[PDB]
Design an enzyme around this catalytic site. Structure first.
Site, PDB file in Angstrom:
ATOM      1  NE  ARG A 121      25.895   9.712  15.517  1.00  0.00           N
ATOM      2  CZ  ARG A 121      24.700   9.653  16.104  1.00  0.00           C
ATOM      3  NH1 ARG A 121      24.550   9.074  17.288  1.00  0.00           N
ATOM      4  NH2 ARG A 121      23.645  10.176  15.497  1.00  0.00           N
ATOM      5  CG  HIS A 138      23.483   3.398  18.017  1.00  0.00           C
ATOM      6  ND1 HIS A 138      24.101   3.922  16.902  1.00  0.00           N
ATOM      7  CD2 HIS A 138      22.832   4.430  18.606  1.00  0.00           C
ATOM      8  CE1 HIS A 138      23.833   5.213  16.819  1.00  0.00           C
ATOM      9  NE2 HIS A 138      23.063   5.547  17.840  1.00  0.00           N
TER      10      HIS A 138
HETATM   11  N1  LIG Z   1      21.511   6.211  21.112  1.00  0.00           N
HETATM   12  C1  LIG Z   1      22.514   7.084  21.185  1.00  0.00           C
HETATM   13  O1  LIG Z   1      23.644   6.692  21.445  1.00  0.00           O
HETATM   14  C2  LIG Z   1      22.276   8.557  20.969  1.00  0.00           C
HETATM   15  C3  LIG Z   1      20.997   9.103  20.964  1.00  0.00           C
HETATM   16  C4  LIG Z   1      20.836  10.462  20.768  1.00  0.00           C
HETATM   17  C5  LIG Z   1      21.956  11.255  20.579  1.00  0.00           C
HETATM   18  N2  LIG Z   1      23.176  10.715  20.572  1.00  0.00           N
HETATM   19  C6  LIG Z   1      24.328  11.594  20.368  1.00  0.00           C
HETATM   20  O2  LIG Z   1      24.377  12.609  21.375  1.00  0.00           O
HETATM   21  C7  LIG Z   1      24.808  13.828  20.768  1.00  0.00           C
HETATM   22  C8  LIG Z   1      24.398  15.040  21.593  1.00  0.00           C
HETATM   23  O3  LIG Z   1      23.038  15.376  21.361  1.00  0.00           O
HETATM   24  P1  LIG Z   1      22.485  16.760  21.955  1.00  0.00           P
HETATM   25  O4  LIG Z   1      21.025  16.853  21.596  1.00  0.00           O
HETATM   26  O5  LIG Z   1      22.938  16.898  23.391  1.00  0.00           O
HETATM   27  O6  LIG Z   1      23.336  17.778  21.042  1.00  0.00           O
HETATM   28  P2  LIG Z   1      23.494  19.356  21.336  1.00  0.00           P
HETATM   29  O7  LIG Z   1      22.328  19.828  22.162  1.00  0.00           O
HETATM   30  O8  LIG Z   1      23.819  20.026  20.021  1.00  0.00           O
HETATM   31  O9  LIG Z   1      24.812  19.401  22.259  1.00  0.00           O
HETATM   32  C9  LIG Z   1      26.112  19.301  21.689  1.00  0.00           C
HETATM   33  C10 LIG Z   1      27.161  19.766  22.692  1.00  0.00           C
HETATM   34  O10 LIG Z   1      28.472  19.443  22.225  1.00  0.00           O
HETATM   35  C11 LIG Z   1      29.298  20.602  22.323  1.00  0.00           C
HETATM   36  N3  LIG Z   1      30.331  20.667  21.272  1.00  0.00           N
HETATM   37  C12 LIG Z   1      30.152  20.511  19.945  1.00  0.00           C
HETATM   38  N4  LIG Z   1      31.331  20.660  19.291  1.00  0.00           N
HETATM   39  C13 LIG Z   1      32.275  20.921  20.213  1.00  0.00           C
HETATM   40  C14 LIG Z   1      33.727  21.189  20.217  1.00  0.00           C
HETATM   41  N5  LIG Z   1      34.438  21.205  19.068  1.00  0.00           N
HETATM   42  N6  LIG Z   1      34.322  21.415  21.405  1.00  0.00           N
HETATM   43  C15 LIG Z   1      33.645  21.409  22.566  1.00  0.00           C
HETATM   44  N7  LIG Z   1      32.327  21.168  22.633  1.00  0.00           N
HETATM   45  C16 LIG Z   1      31.607  20.928  21.516  1.00  0.00           C
HETATM   46  C17 LIG Z   1      28.364  21.794  22.189  1.00  0.00           C
HETATM   47  O11 LIG Z   1      28.880  22.960  22.823  1.00  0.00           O
HETATM   48  P3  LIG Z   1      28.039  24.339  22.853  1.00  0.00           P
HETATM   49  O12 LIG Z   1      26.959  24.085  23.875  1.00  0.00           O
HETATM   50  O13 LIG Z   1      29.070  25.352  23.279  1.00  0.00           O
HETATM   51  O14 LIG Z   1      27.529  24.519  21.446  1.00  0.00           O
HETATM   52  C18 LIG Z   1      27.128  21.276  22.878  1.00  0.00           C
HETATM   53  O15 LIG Z   1      27.205  21.603  24.258  1.00  0.00           O
HETATM   54  C19 LIG Z   1      24.227  13.787  19.361  1.00  0.00           C
HETATM   55  O16 LIG Z   1      24.981  14.580  18.441  1.00  0.00           O
HETATM   56  C20 LIG Z   1      24.269  12.307  19.028  1.00  0.00           C
HETATM   57  O17 LIG Z   1      25.460  11.993  18.311  1.00  0.00           O
HETATM   58  C21 LIG Z   1      23.361   9.400  20.771  1.00  0.00           C
END
Ligand SMILES: NC(=O)c1ccc[n+]([C@@H]2O[C@H](COP(=O)([O-])OP(=O)(O)OC[C@H]3O[C@@H](n4cnc5c(N)ncnc54)[C@H](OP(=O)(O)O)[C@@H]3O)[C@@H](O)[C@H]2O)c1
Ligand SMILES: NC(=O)c1ccc[n+]([C@@H]2O[C@H](COP(=O)([O-])OP(=O)(O)OC[C@H]3O[C@@H](n4cnc5c(N)ncnc54)[C@H](OP(=O)(O)O)[C@@H]3O)[C@@H](O)[C@H]2O)c1
Ligand SMILES: [K+]
Ligand SMILES: [K+]
Ligand code: NA
Ligand code: NA
Lengths: 313, 313
Positions: free
Chosen positions: A228, A276
């Site tokens: 993001r 994006h």
């Molecule tokens: N086109 C694009 O650019 C696109 C597409 C899809 C997604 N995204 C982005 O990618 C992100 C990740 O997606 P995902 O499915 O991988 O999410 P996810 O499975 O919820 O993974 C989030 C990770 O971030 C970590 N995290 C969250 N808050 C934290 C903090 N304060 N300190 C340290 N680590 C923290 C979490 O740790 P834990 O494992 O310990 O909970 C988890 O490992 C999405 O939220 C979205 O914004 C972008």
């Protein structure tokens, strides 16, 4: 028998309705319009209006994306929008894992093989082989070790890069050193030749990629922001690019989208911009995940992909 | 006990001598200078002078590269240079396989994800998501299905691209359609969205990538020349780039190296140039392959990596 209401600001609404009817033949699917207060069991939404969900005792809401920061921020401003009894789900992978792998592997190898240096030399019609980089000097750190972070780590491990990840809780991935919490972030950063951001947008992560973080990276580091835009303080990144601290940055997301034309990021030599598109929602895979999740909910099977509203993601 | 003579026009001669002495402790290793007519059992060479090999009944010659077209062409002009009794070996992989995989995977994904289109749009500070390409429309054809061609095919198969290869003899790789001989080249080309050249330079392959070959490719094709420059008729490629037949070409090798500054390839918008660095010889891996091959020769074990002088590679 179930009722499903669907809303998306730009997708092909009619295609989604028909695809859902086929995947869930017992379901009555309809596009939600203002004034529609008829009953519904499930809601599939992206940037939903408050009116669509307020007061509804839905069995579940499915956000049509991996990130849910826009819905959660709207719920913070309008607590009446989603009853606490309603479980909130997001899209887990559904093809976005492979898309992040494609993006990350291509660009990591691009930098590792110095294609950016050779392009600069080509601009001057200058022929000059350069020393090859070594994997031991190219540790890759992944900010966020979740659904997408794990997929990216796995694909890069295939290429024998040293790997580390950062998250709230410890991970057990062989060959990937797991760092956890703010108290370990500095140690995590110290070796990241390439920093890949796959964090969610939460109050605890806003602006995390700032001057203090960038200065802890090794010299000649690379930044890949796939998460993001609010994660990056763009003026701090520009300063690190101009000083030589960061050799290159490829950015798919920005504080304001579309990125305004006045942003110095557009024309900065070491910046690569995509609008994006790192991992887009593929309707067919999303319909399959949603229909399968609903079936699992009906059978009482423990489900993955549920948002923790207190946690923020 | 053996005598080894070493020659390379630019490498660190003294490093190689010492590394060889360690890997083959019974060997007496020396750098070859003009006038050295003392006995030798093995010769390690790159661009060797005729005098170094002429009249020597060597047990084997090791060319310090994967390609041997320069030695074979010199032997054609100076048949006295290498006695027919002397077996000729080249470097098989020795880390060049992975280097070709890095190069090919990075750039194929680069094109597949339209990073070239987004860069053009970035030049104008223009924000515009583009339709994603589909694997079914991105068949990858590999000209030459050998040591390096097989490695590249394997790495791209990991990404679920449709794959085909072209060689003299049929291949058995699951999921990769094998085309063989000039009589099947047209059918091979008809579906190649991406054409990757990993052929050797032989009289039968010189100039193979010409107007007649390029016109048989699908529209918007991509060319990746990782092999030898003589394979491409550069004026024919430029014409195909200017007409829109070829959307992009990344070239590591050229008819004249260094590529003269007057070449239109340097400044052509859809051309990417690297200065013959796709897969460099890594001394440590080469020393290991050579020392191991010599041991296999001494034990009478059947060996791979031998050049067929009648065949030309
Ligand atoms: N086109 C694009 O650019 C696109 C597409 C899809 C997604 N995204 C982005 O990618 C992100 C990740 O997606 P995902 O499915 O991988 O999410 P996810 O499975 O919820 O993974 C989030 C990770 O971030 C970590 N995290 C969250 N808050 C934290 C903090 N304060 N300190 C340290 N680590 C923290 C979490 O740790 P834990 O494992 O310990 O909970 C988890 O490992 C999405 O939220 C979205 O914004 C972008
Ligand atoms: N930095 C660089 O750019 C770099 C580095 C290393 C190598 N290279 C180049 O890459 C080339 C390939 O190396 P390699 O180790 O893969 O060689 P290889 O194992 O000998 O493979 C050569 C392949 O080309 C095919 N071939 C040869 N002549 C042909 C013809 N007339 N028609 C159809 N197919 C033909 C062969 O078919 P069969 O299998 O039927 O014999 C074989 O599959 C080298 O010769 C070198 O020029 C470039
Ligand atoms: K900006
Ligand atoms: K030229
Ligand atoms: Na309808
Ligand atoms: Na010496």
């Amino acid at each position: 028998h179930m009722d499903i209401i669907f809303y998306h600001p730009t997708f092909d609404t009619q295609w989604w309705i028909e695809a859902l009817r086929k995947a869930i033949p017992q379901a009555r699917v309809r596009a939600w319009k203002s004034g529609d207060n008829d009953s519904a069991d499930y809601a599939l939404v992206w940037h939903p209006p408050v009116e669509m969900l307020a007061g509804r005792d839905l069995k579940a809401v499915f956000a049509l994306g991996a990130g849910v920061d826009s819905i959660l921020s709207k719920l913070q401003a309008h607590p009446e929008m989603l009853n606490p009894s309603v479980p909130l789900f997001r899209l887990e992978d559904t093809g976005m894992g492979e898309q992040m792998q494609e993006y990350a592997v291509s660009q990591v190898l691009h930098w590792f093989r110095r294609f950016d240096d050779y392009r600069i030399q080509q601009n001057s019609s200058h022929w000059q082989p350069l020393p090859e980089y070594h994997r031991e000097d190219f540790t890759i750190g992944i900010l966020g070790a979740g659904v997408l972070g794990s997929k990216v780590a796995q694909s890069l491990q295939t290429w024998r890069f040293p790997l580390r990840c950062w998250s709230r809780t410890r991970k057990s991935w062989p060959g990937v050193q797991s760092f956890a919490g703010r108290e370990e972030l500095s140690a995590f950063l110290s070796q990241c030749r390439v920093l890949i951001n796959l964090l969610p947008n939460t109050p605890e992560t806003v602006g995390i990629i700032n001057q203090q973080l960038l200065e802890k990276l090794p010299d000649g580091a690379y930044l890949l922001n796939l998460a993001r835009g609010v994660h990056v303080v763009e003026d701090d990144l520009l300063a690190a690019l101009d000083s030589g601290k960061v050799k290159g940055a490829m950015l798919d997301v920005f504080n304001r989208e579309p990125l305004p034309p006045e942003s110095p990021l557009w024309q900065h030599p070491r910046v690569t911009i995509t609008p994006h598109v790192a991992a887009i929602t593929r309707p067919a895979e999303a319909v399959e995940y949603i229909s399968r999740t609903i079936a699992q909910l009906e059978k009482g099977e423990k489900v993955c992909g549920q948002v923790d509203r207190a946690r923020g993601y």
